[PDB]
Point group: C3
Chain length 112, copies 3
C-alpha cells in the first residue's frame, strides 16, 4: 500500500538527482535515466554500439575508408525513445565508443 | 514481502547520493531530498515561488518599490519541514527564482 | 511494483558511476558493492571504535598501532577490500587520523 508511496518518492528523487549530473561528463547516463529506459533497453543500446564498433574496426582492417552505412544501421535500430543526434553526442562526450562516434559525427557533418 | 528490503536499500542509496551533490550548484534539490519532501510537496514549494515571483513582477510594473509583505507570505505558506532562510538561499544558489530571491535576501538583510 | 524497483536499482547503478571519485569514493564504494544500510553503518562503527582506541593509545604514550589495522581487516565486511576501503575513506576525508595510521602501516608491510 504505502510501499508504492515509498517507490514514488524514490522515483521523484532520481528525477531530481539526474538533474544534478555533470552533463559534460556523463550525458549518456543522464539521457538513459531522463528518457526512462529500462536496464534491458540501456544494455541493448550498448550492444548496438558494440557491434557497430566491431564492424567498423573490421571494415577498416579490410581497407574500407567510408562507413556511411553504419550510421543508417545505428539510426534504424536505436531505441525510438532516443534521438540519434542527441544519443551520439552524449556517448561521444561521455567518452564511450570513441571510434564509432567520431565516424558518426563525421557522417552527420557531411549530410546535415 | 521482501520488496520492502530492496526499497530500504534504495532509500539508503539515495541518502548517500544526495550527500555527493555539488552544494554550490544544486542545494535546493539536495534540500528537498534531505528533508524528505514528496513530489507533491516539492512541487507545492515551486508553485509558491511561481506565484510570488509573478506578484513581484506585477507590483514592479505597477510602480511598487518595496515588497516586504511577499516574504511574510512566503514564510507563512512554506512547508513546515523547511527553514525559510535555508530554502531561500538554496533556491538562490541553484539559480532559481532569482528576482524573488534577491528581494527576499534584501528584506532579510534589513530585518535580521 | 517489482519492475519500478528494478528500474530504480538500474538508475542508482548509473548514478553511482557519475560520482566524483576524488570526493566521495567511500559512498560510491558502499553502493557499488551492494552493502545495506546496516552494513554501511557497521563499517563506520568499526572506524569509530578503532579511531577512539587510537586516540586513547596515543594519549597513553603508544607510538605504534599495527594491531589496529589487523583488527580492522579482521572485522571489515567481507564484501569490501581492505586497501580499497581505507583509501576511499581517506580520500573522502573520513577518519583522517585512523586512515593515515593504516596507510602508514600498509606502506611498511606491503
Ligand atoms: Na527499426
Ligand atoms: Na500556514
Ligand atoms: Na571475522
Ligand atoms: Zn560483439
Ligand atoms: Zn502563476
Ligand atoms: Zn565509540
Amino acid at each position: 500500500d504505502s510501499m508504492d508511496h515509498r517507490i514514488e518518492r524514490l522515483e521523484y528523487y532520481i528525477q531530481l538527482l539526474v538533474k544534478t549530473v555533470d552533463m559534460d561528463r556523463y550525458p549518456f547516463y543522464a539521457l538513459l535515466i531522463d528518457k526512462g529506459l529500462s536496464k534491458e533497453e540501456g544494455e541493448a543500446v550498448m550492444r548496438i554500439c558494440d557491434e557497430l564498433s566491431e564492424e567498423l574496426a573490421t571494415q577498416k582492417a579490410q581497407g574500407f575508408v567510408t562507413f556511411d552505412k553504419l550510421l543508417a544501421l545505428f539510426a534504424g535500430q536505436l531505441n525510438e525513445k532516443l534521438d540519434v543526434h542527441e544519443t551520439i553526442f552524449a556517448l561521444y562526450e561521455q567518452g564511450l565508443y570513441q571510434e564509432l562516434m567520431e565516424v558518426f559525427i563525421d557522417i552527420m557533418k557531411h549530410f546535415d
